[PDB]
Amino acid sequence: GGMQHNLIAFLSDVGSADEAHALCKGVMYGVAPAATIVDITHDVAPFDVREGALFLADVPHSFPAHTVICATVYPETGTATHTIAVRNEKGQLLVGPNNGLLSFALDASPAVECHEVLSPDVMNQPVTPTWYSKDIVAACAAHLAAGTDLAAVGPRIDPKQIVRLPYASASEVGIRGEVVRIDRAFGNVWTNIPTHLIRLEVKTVLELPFCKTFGEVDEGQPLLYLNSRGRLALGLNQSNFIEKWPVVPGDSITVSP
Amino acid sequence: GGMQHNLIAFLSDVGSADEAHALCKGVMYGVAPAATIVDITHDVAPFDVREGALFLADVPHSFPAHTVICATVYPETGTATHTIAVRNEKGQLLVGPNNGLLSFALDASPAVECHEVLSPDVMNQPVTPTWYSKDIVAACAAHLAAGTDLAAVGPRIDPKQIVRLPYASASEVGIRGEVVRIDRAFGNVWTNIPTHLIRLEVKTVLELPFCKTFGEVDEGQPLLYLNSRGRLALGLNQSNFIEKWPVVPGDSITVSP
Amino acid sequence: GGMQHNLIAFLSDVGSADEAHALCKGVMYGVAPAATIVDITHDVAPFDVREGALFLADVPHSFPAHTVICATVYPETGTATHTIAVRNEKGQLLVGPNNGLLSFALDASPAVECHEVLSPDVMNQPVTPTWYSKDIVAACAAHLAAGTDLAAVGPRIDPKQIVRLPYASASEVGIRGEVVRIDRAFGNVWTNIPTHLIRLEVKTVLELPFCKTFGEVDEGQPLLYLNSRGRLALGLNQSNFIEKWPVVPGDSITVSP
Numbered sequence: 001g002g003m004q005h006n007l008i009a010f011l012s013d014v015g016s017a018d019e020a021h022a023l024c025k026g027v028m029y030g031v032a033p034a035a036t037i038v039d040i041t042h043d044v045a046p047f048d049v050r051e052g053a054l055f056l057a058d059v060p061h062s063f064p065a066h067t068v069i070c071a072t073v074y075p076e077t078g079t080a081t082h083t084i085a086v087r088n089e090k091g092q093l094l095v096g097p098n099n100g101l102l103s104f105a106l107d108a109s110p111a112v113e114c115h116e117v118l119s120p121d122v123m124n125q126p127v128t129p130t131w132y133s134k135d136i137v138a139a140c141a142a143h144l145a146a147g148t149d150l151a152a153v154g155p156r157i158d159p160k161q162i163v164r165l166p167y168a169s170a171s172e173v174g175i176r177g178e179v180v181r182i183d184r185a186f187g188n189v190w191t192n193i194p195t196h197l198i199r200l201e202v203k204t205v206l207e208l209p210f211c212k213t214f215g216e217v218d219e220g221q222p223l224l225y226l227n228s229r230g231r232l233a234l235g236l237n238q239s240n241f242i243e244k245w246p247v248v249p250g251d252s253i254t255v256s257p
Numbered sequence: 258g259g260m261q262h263n264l265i266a267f268l269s270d271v272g273s274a275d276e277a278h279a280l281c282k283g284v285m286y287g288v289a290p291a292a293t294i295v296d297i298t299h300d301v302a303p304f305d306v307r308e309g310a311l312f313l314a315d316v317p318h319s320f321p322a323h324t325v326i327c328a329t330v331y332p333e334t335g336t337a338t339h340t341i342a343v344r345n346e347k348g349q350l351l352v353g354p355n356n357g358l359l360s361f362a363l364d365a366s367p368a369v370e371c372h373e374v375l376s377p378d379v380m381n382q383p384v385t386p387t388w389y390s391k392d393i394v395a396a397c398a399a400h401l402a403a404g405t406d407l408a409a410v411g412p413r414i415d416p417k418q419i420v421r422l423p424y425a426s427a428s429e430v431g432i433r434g435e436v437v438r439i440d441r442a443f444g445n446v447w448t449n450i451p452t453h454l455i456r457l458e459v460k461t462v463l464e465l466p467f468c469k470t471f472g473e474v475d476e477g478q479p480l481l482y483l484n485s486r487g488r489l490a491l492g493l494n495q496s497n498f499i500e501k502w503p504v505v506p507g508d509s510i511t512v513s514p
Numbered sequence: 515g516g517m518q519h520n521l522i523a524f525l526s527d528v529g530s531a532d533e534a535h536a537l538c539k540g541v542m543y544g545v546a547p548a549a550t551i552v553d554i555t556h557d558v559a560p561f562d563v564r565e566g567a568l569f570l571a572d573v574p575h576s577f578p579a580h581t582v583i584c585a586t587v588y589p590e591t592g593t594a595t596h597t598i599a600v601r602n603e604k605g606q607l608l609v610g611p612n613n614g615l616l617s618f619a620l621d622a623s624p625a626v627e628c629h630e631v632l633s634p635d636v637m638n639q640p641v642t643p644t645w646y647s648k649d650i651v652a653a654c655a656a657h658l659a660a661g662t663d664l665a666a667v668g669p670r671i672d673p674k675q676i677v678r679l680p681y682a683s684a685s686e687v688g689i690r691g692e693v694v695r696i697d698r699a700f701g702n703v704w705t706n707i708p709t710h711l712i713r714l715e716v717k718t719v720l721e722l723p724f725c726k727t728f729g730e731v732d733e734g735q736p737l738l739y740l741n742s743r744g745r746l747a748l749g750l751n752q753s754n755f756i757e758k759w760p761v762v763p764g765d766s767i768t769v770s771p
């Protein structure tokens with residue numbers, strides 16, 4: 001049966017500059033009054049399922065077991081692509097479109113049970129075809145939060161029926177990797193190079209010192225370091241790296257002695 | 258007498274980029290510790306009472322009955338224009354400046370009882386003339402949330418004494434309407450044409466297919482559809498419509514066979 | 515011993531455009547499930563300790579006594595500069611880097627007891643050198659919120675060992691002052707001139723009327739007024755002042771009859 005998950009972790013691409021995300025929400029308190037709603041972010045680039053998926057990766061680990069991860073970038077709203085409900089190995093519940101959005105969250109804690117959200121009893125009637133995020137995803141997330149059995153949302157599916165996004169691995173060739181994501185607020189660059197395969201040379205060619213933290217080099221100076229995810233990163237001490245060297249997600253990066 | 262409304266729905270134009278909205282809030286927890294504060298948005302254009310009012314329209318329906326709708330775009334702060342407190346037909350309470358801000362929220366669920374907020378016992382002493390939003394609107398919203406009788410805020414007024422913003426209707430002439438609001442995050446255009454009066458022709462003249470949802474046309478292609486509010490809308494499938502055809506609120510739109 | 519502080523007031527520079535601030539947070543609910551987390555703001559300019567400190571000034575007064583003020587602009591993360599935990603005269607608890615961030619908050623309500631956060635039992639193991647904000651500041655803030663004794667975080671220090679940021683006073687010379695902060699959302703200018711030392715002349719030279727509130731002058735017209743903090747301010751009635759006269763923090767301002 002169901003279990004109370006009092007904490008809803010809410011992620012979308014509708015922004016926080018208008019009421020859309022708050023309505024969702026209004027709906028969620030209606031179903032689950034006791035729930036604590038927490039925004040992950042709503043400022044995922046429009047339709048960008050990959051970026052949303054990347055933002056969700058560290059969520060399962062950072063959040064307690066009584067969490068409903070509600071992911072809501074759904075450009076396929078009102079079409080054949082369904083919403084899915086998942087229970088992971090930590091015990092957390094997650095709800096979102098079966099479009100690859102939960103890919104990296106499930107890498108952190110794998111799927112133990114999944115179901116397609118097909119039952120109207122966990123939906124917000126009547127369902128608007130252009131707003132599945134509110135009427136299906138958010139509504140279902142609140143029902144599971146209130147303690148609804150996972151089985152009641154719809155029929156069981158295999159974990160392989162969950163759409164997964166491709167993630168490129170770094171390999172020893174020197175080690176070649178790529179830029180996965182830029183830390184928007186600061187301009188730091190994150191790579192897919194783990195601890196793990198490792199003054200070094202990074203290829204434009206640069207000689208960068210490897211540090212434990214930002215303040216080990218002078219203000220404005222570049223550095224290499226390992227982030228919280230065990231991956232290699234580039235930054236300027238108290239400055240914006242991608243304003244000096246404008247890299248984009250997907251670009252190659254090679255590290256050699 | 259009063260009734261507990263545990264959920265505060267908070268809307269302003271002060272943004273979320275500094276502490277202003279959080280102070281409000283600090284004040285609200287002081288009066289009502291048990292209250293759950295939820296932002297509708299704070300990114301209403303400065304002084305734009307119309308935009309704020311549009312953001313509030315779907316709030317009464319989306320939110321449960323134990324909600325205090327706290328609306329806070331108040332360029333008339335410290336002048337003769339008072340704050341009002343309202344109880345609607347759903348049972349929800351709403352507080353804001355009598356400047357037209359609650360207009361469209363009251364269209365959704367009409368006013369059953371109204372009072373001007375004049376009593377200092379529901380205010381945050383001393384009241385700063387430049388911050389009525391915090392010291393009167395937010396403070397009063399928290400008092401009503403805690404269970405304060407509506408009558409205690411100040412003297413009763415007639416619903417007609419509530420300032421209302423004009424809303425232009427769409428009419429059959431072909432059907433002529435206007436652009437009411439642009440969906441900032443995606444670039445979708447919303448019109449005032451209901452379900453209801455309706456490949457069609459939209460006047461620059463365009464031939465657009467009428468769809469149930471975005472993904473019924475190819476990526477980048479334009480479409481016509483009905484939104485959650487039962488009104489006609491324009492969009493590009495996974496793209497920004499007002500970047501292709503830059504329309505602004507108020508502009509005419511005619512739909513013919 | 516410790517006391518429950520159920521309300522966490524959370525301030526950072528990591529923005530709300532991605533998951534970073536929400537992870538912090540995830541961590542906080544893990545330690546303190548009953549806690550109510552409230553964002554002050556996350557849109558403090560990168561590394562800008564001064565701006566963050568200014569945003570915190572009015573927080574102690576606006577917020578109740580059971581608040582943990584969690585301040586998190588920490589460019590010195592992973593270096594010798596430690597996190598500190600403070601209990602002020604109001605009874606509130608505050609946690610942040612000993613880099614000047616809590617300076618103006620402590621001006622409002624002075625430090626009664628302080629400790630450096632050195633114990634791992636109030637931290638999030640293992641601590642990432644690049645994320646002290648999450649693993650030390652946010653974790654410790656949640657522990658104190660749950661009721662952990664202030665003494666348990668680490669060794670006691672003197673209040674003078676707390677780094678303080680310099681604040682320039684306005685003086686009678688006519689009264690000379692400076693621009694402290696610009697009200698981002700509206701364009702209003704705040705000065706360091708108190709009530710207190712005061713149609714007036716403001717030096718480019720302008721003749722401005724002194725008003726109680728914005729609407730005492732015609733739309734678009736400039737005015738002088740006192741803000742909620744008892745300090746002199748400049749603005750345009752329903753317009754953006756720094757778009758007409760582009761002043762920056764630090765610039766001189768002289769007021770004479």
Ligand SMILES: Nc1ncnc2c1ncn2[C@@H]1O[C@H](CCl)[C@@H](O)[C@H]1O
Pocket residue numbers: 013014046047072073074075076077130131132133134443445471472492493494495496
């Ligand atoms: N023009 C558009 N094309 C495709 N999808 C769109 C869209 N506008 C909004 N959405 C998508 O609609 C979802 C609501 Cl269910 C939101 O997540 C948003 O991603």
Ligand SMILES: Nc1ncnc2c1ncn2[C@@H]1O[C@H](CCl)[C@@H](O)[C@H]1O
Pocket residue numbers: 270271303304329330331332333334387388389390391700702728729749750751752753
């Ligand atoms: N320069 C200005 N002119 C007129 N109104 C202003 C203003 N600055 C802020 N407000 C208005 O002051 C209110 C606080 Cl009570 C906020 O809602 C804001 O809308």
Ligand SMILES: Nc1ncnc2c1ncn2[C@@H]1O[C@H](CCl)[C@@H](O)[C@H]1O
Pocket residue numbers: 186188214215235236237238239527528560561586587588589590591644645646647648
């Ligand atoms: N490139 C950089 N240089 C110096 N400090 C940086 C930084 N990037 C993030 N931080 C700082 O890291 C803290 C996490 Cl503990 C955040 O508060 C942020 O202020």
Ligand code: MET
Pocket residue numbers: 183188226227228233528534642644645
């Ligand atoms: C998210 S705060 C600073 C960014 C950094 N790269 C870290 O180690 O995550």
Ligand code: MET
Pocket residue numbers: 014020128130131440445483484485490
């Ligand atoms: C708010 S999500 C997508 C926008 C859309 N027009 C809808 O039907 O509201």
Ligand code: MET
Pocket residue numbers: 271277385387388697702740741742747
């Ligand atoms: C923060 S709302 C309007 C700004 C104003 N200067 C006030 O008195 O704080």
